[PDB]
Design a protein around this ligand. Structure first.
Ligand SMILES: Cc1[nH]c2ccccc2c(=O)c1O
Ligand SMILES: [K+]
Length: 273
């Protein structure tokens, strides 16, 4: 895109999107998951471009030119993101994550605190601890002999039987340059995050300062999954959710207008106190 930059962040050259829009805060900080980059957000960036400053960091070894890097996890993703924000002179921001980018978002909320990061939106992020199929996928990602098979199994799940042209392009073309260095790492980091924090829901509830967080998701589509979101929301005044009804696990791509209205809602709320 026109908006793509690169800067040195501690030891690493990281790319990032910044539309440099001069306007009222908060900045919208779109956070990628593992082994993809800002390209996942291109449609969402267009929905928001005009009214908001939009920043998208890419993680170590991530970007248009993936590279091998030393092992790191979500704690480092958080430090990386804040340093980029510091370099840009961004104070207040609304973080928005995709899938396991949520580990970065929640830890970012903790580290940045409620004045800098008063709310967050998490998109399509498995709220319960891994079921057998996903646990199996993580096991495959970690295997140097079966990692690609692992990614293919996830692509099947994420597409959910749909010939969704834009999401297919993202998975098959826009993730194609990522190798075992990333996918193995993602398997280890995500597996460790669940192991260490229990679940995304446990981690959020354990925040020192709880804050408005909304989970917007299209998948999984089963009633049992909606129920754990409804139950969590019943218990925690600060949590909400919305089932977006898109075909794939990538609503930022396949229902960008819907993702956008939820983001605008939270940004509008922040602007009113
Ligand atoms: C972009 C992205 N990357 C991942 C890497 C490993 C395991 C799960 C994920 C995931 O769910 C997701 O959406
Ligand atoms: K609630």
């Amino acid at each position: 895109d026109t908006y793509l930059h690169e800067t040195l962040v501690f030891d690493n050259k990281l790319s990032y999107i910044d539309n440099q829009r001069d306007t009222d805060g908060p900045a919208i900080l779109l956070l990628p998951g593992w082994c993809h980059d800002h390209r996942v957000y291109k449609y969402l960036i267009q929905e928001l471009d005009a009214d908001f400053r939009v920043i998208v960091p890419n993680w170590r070894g991530h970007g248009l030119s993936p590279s091998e890097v030393p092992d790191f996890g979500y704690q480092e993703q958080v430090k990386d993101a804040l340093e980029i924000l510091d370099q840009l002179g961004v104070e207040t921001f609304l973080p928005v994550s995709h899938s396991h980018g949520g580990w970065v978002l929640v830890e970012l909320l903790e580290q940045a605190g409620p004045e800098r990061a008063p709310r967050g939106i998490i998109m399509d992020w498995l709220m319960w601890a891994p079921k057998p199929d996903f646990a199996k996928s993580l096991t495959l990602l970690k295997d140097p002999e079966r990692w690609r098979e692992g990614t293919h199994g996830l692509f099947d799940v994420w597409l959910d039987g749909h010939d969704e042209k834009r999401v297919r392009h993202h998975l098959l073309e826009e993730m194609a340059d990522y190798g075992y260095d990333c996918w193995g790492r993602s398997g280890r980091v995500i597996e460790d995050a669940y192991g260490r924090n229990g679940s995304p829901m446990q981690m959020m509830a354990n925040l020192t300062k709880t804050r408005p967080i909304r989970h917007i998701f299209s998948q999984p589509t089963e009633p049992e999954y909606e129920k754990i979101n409804s139950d969590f929301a019943e218990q925690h005044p600060w949590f909400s959710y919305a089932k977006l009804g898109g075909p794939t696990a990538f609503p930022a791509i396949d229902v960008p207008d819907r993702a956008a209205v939820h983001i605008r809602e939270f940004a509008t709320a922040i602007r009113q106190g």
